[PDB]
Design a protein around this ligand. Structure first.
Ligand code: K
Ligand code: OH
Ligand code: SM
Ligand code: SM
Ligand code: SM
Ligand code: SM
Length: 341
DNA sequence: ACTCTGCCTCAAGACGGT
DNA sequence: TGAGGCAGAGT
DNA sequence: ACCGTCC
């Protein structure tokens, strides 16, 4: 993420944010940060503070969400491609260490909340310990294949590869909550795309070109702004928040120039600041080749889906079979069969 | 008065019978 | 792999 | 729309 970027845009570039009704998206393709949505399901999809699971102890919360949400999207003629995170860049090592530190603390506090019986505390610390694993990813991929829904493995950060897919015109937008997708250059970011049958949060599109126009910046300058706001890849300058950062960038145009003009006593910069490395990472990230794989939405394998979800994962046969019928008919409505010439 | 930091707390899904 | 509220302190 | 339940 980028610290306070969403709020900053709402305050200083409101026209970059557009809202449309879900009925307007029929036929559109979108790239989805899979690892992130699996995470959301593991955290939220609970009964008695416990994830859903089959009788043999295997978690099924993530399969539950991925199955049903994907179908609801397709019912609206929205065609998702799911993108999975790869190996993190070295620059992120610091941030990851911080996370593992927090996990170690959370593990202690979980234990003591248990010897204290504090059930609501236990639930909190258990949520803090939720972690998307390789098995979670492998099960979702397996499921998506059976559903006929495409997915890709990013070489590194999935947001970066989502952005690259939008730039190449392979999908219309990147659908994620992580704003660093814009820092990676995604022309369009959709937030709150769940296509939920219960409404709530309006669908928001962020348009990068509108953002750059409103702030009066090019993409290089925008990335420098984000670094100053605070990213995962390097430190920012203490004392410099969203307000002073926009002004410094609009005036000095670059962190390099900002540092030369800043008084080393009033606003000292981080020692051995890696802003240059991060800048390079946001602008030239390692990404999949968007011309490589042709995205297709295939017919769902109904019988194998039933064996997997019902036979193995113990989902209701009625709900699953009903889901597959809906998915199949909705695909038929929004997708053209392949043609040979 | 405007700005920023540190610390707190909170929320985080989908289906279907009613 | 946040967000927003609040008190206190820096500009 | 609410809310008990989903696995
Ligand atoms: K800062
Ligand atoms: O992020
Ligand atoms: Sm990210
Ligand atoms: Sm990521
Ligand atoms: Sm079994
Ligand atoms: Sm098993």
């Amino acid at each position: 993420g980028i610290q306070g970027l969403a709020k900053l845009i709402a305050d200083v570039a409101p026209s970059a944010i557009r809202e449309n009704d879900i009925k307007s998206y029929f036929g559109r393709k979108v790239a989805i940060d899979a690892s992130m949505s699996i995470y959301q399901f593991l955290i939220a999809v609970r009964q008695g503070g416990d994830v859903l699971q089959n009788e043999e102890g295997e978690t099924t919360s993530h399969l539950m969400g991925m199955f049903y949400r994907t179908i609801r999207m397709m019912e609206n003629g929205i065609k998702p491609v799911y993108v999975f995170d790869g190996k993190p860049p070295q620059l992120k090592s610091g941030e990851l260490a911080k996370r593992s530190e927090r996990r170690a603390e959370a593990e202690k506090q979980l234990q003591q909340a248990q010897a204290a019986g504090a059930e609501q505390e236990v639930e909190k610390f258990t949520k803090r310990l939720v972690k998307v694993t390789k098995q979670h990813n492998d099960e979702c991929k397996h499921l998506l294949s059976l559903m006929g829904i495409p997915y890709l493995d990013a070489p590194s950060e999935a947001e970066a590869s989502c952005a690259a897919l939008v730039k190449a015109g392979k999908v219309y937008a990147a659908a994620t909550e992580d704003m660093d997708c814009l820092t990676f250059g995604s022309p369009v970011l959709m937030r709150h795309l769940t296509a939920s049958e219960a409404k709530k949060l309006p669908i928001q599109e962020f348009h990068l070109s509108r953002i750059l126009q409103e702030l009066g910046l090019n993409q290089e300058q925008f990335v420098d702004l984000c670094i100053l706001l605070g990213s995962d890849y390097c430190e920012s300058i203490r004392g410099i928040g969203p307000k002073r950062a926009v002004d410094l960038i609009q005036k000095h145009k670059s962190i390099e120039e900002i540092v030369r003009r800043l008084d080393p006593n009033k606003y000292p910069v981080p020692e051995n600041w890696l802003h240059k490395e991060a800048h390079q990472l946001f602008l030239e990230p390692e990404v999949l080749d968007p011309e490589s794989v042709e995205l297709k939405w295939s017919e769902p394998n109904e019988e194998e889906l039933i064996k997997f979800m019902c036979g193995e994962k113990q989902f209701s046969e009625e709900r699953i079979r009903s889901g597959v019928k809906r998915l199949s008919k909705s695909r038929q409505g929004s997708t053209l069969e392949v043609l040979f010439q």
